[PDB]
Amino acid sequence: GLYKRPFNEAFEETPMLVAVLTYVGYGVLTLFGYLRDFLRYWRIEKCHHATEREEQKDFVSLYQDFENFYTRNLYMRIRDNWNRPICSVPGARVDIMERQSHDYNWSFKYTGNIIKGVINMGSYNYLGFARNTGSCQEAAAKVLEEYGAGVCSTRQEIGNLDKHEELEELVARFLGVEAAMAYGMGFATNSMNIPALVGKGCLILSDELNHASLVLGARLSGATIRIFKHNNMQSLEKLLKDAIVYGQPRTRRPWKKILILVEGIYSMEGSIVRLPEVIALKKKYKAYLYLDEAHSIGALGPTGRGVVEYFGLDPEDVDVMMGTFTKSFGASGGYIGGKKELIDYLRTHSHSAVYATSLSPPVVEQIITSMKCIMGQDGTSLGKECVQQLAENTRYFRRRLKEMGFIIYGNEDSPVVPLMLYMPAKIGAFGREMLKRNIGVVVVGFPATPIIESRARFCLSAAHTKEILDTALKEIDEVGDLLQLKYSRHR
């Protein structure tokens, strides 16, 4: 495969001193955690956690205490960063209900006052459709008045409505594939439609950084799972060759199927998948492709049709196209697109259709209205404006952040920008300092990531203006000066 335009990604390596220092910090935390646990065990220090009721003392202990080691010792110290309640629409500016704790984050008590105007860089807005006023809200209100809050049965029995059918045909037209099917949860889409496609005696080649839903769907099916390196086409060639040549592990038999699970944009890294190469190998080795366009269905592409439009390839090359409405379109749900026989088989033999409740009518109405707005069916130019504004914002933000001396991951086109903090204490420090300057960011630590790579993710949007980006960039530069977060040798 070849690229019609350059494909440039930068993953700068960690400085050695920073690695030594983060190991020092983790060792200190581990030793103090062991001392903490000893003190709590010998009842010298009071334990604030709940306890099993006295009637079940002789029962086997519910949890293994070593499993929650990091929860009590490392997670609880900076627990105030994550579960931050909000009390307004998650636009470019969000209102956060401010909270305080006096028992060192074990229990939080809410103060009356409320923060206002916090710049939102943690919500998944990509086209700015999360608005409490507009045309989509009016249509959703109309359908809510007509239809109600939710359906009370499954698709197969009585829960199929006309709204679902028209949403499915609209999605099929939008993607470009023959047919599509819709579900009420993006997680459930994978977890219930991967077991149906593959079973015992098949092979699944998962990326190194796949989402939890894809992994759970792979495990629920009896297929064998092999993990190849992140965006390493050579590794994918090697696993495909070995799987085809050597067959099944115990008794040498041909694989019934070979399925490759990949995503458009990986949220944490921000790296766009090398789609032309993987499609080339898929065709060469006669494999099947499952593409998760959860993050790229609205963010990427000149018109917002996904990575298949960003690269310019043919949607018929991708066998299964999963997708999620939560990120870009501003409403919950999910979908799978493909050929008509695939959609019929999924309509008949999918867990979600048989046993699970359908989508809500206002939600499908909001999805329909937003999708019509993107494709220009309303007749206005609002569809193209947001798509070009998002690209302008992401290019400006990434360029200015990289020229300041920070370390940034991923491709230059991906709207998600991971800055690297590299140290356990700088996670909480960055979170608290950024909140003190009225900016909301998301910090990811050790057990999720590798040990040396701890990050903070900025999710950009088309709702952000130039003034908001300038304010955020100035605050980021000031904080990076304060915490010495500029680790880049190149600039």
Partner: protein
Amino acid sequence: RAWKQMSWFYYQYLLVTALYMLEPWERTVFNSMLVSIVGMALYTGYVFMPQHIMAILHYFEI
């Protein structure tokens, strides 16, 4: 001025060694252990090893 500079250096010391997250008495324990170890090291270096860092310290003072 200089007091603010020392406060900044102490803040960086807290950030690097992950004492920022710990409760104040844990900070006291860690600081006391570090100070005792450093004092013991200086005592041993003065008594046993020949005074060679003393010349460098005097040159730095000058």
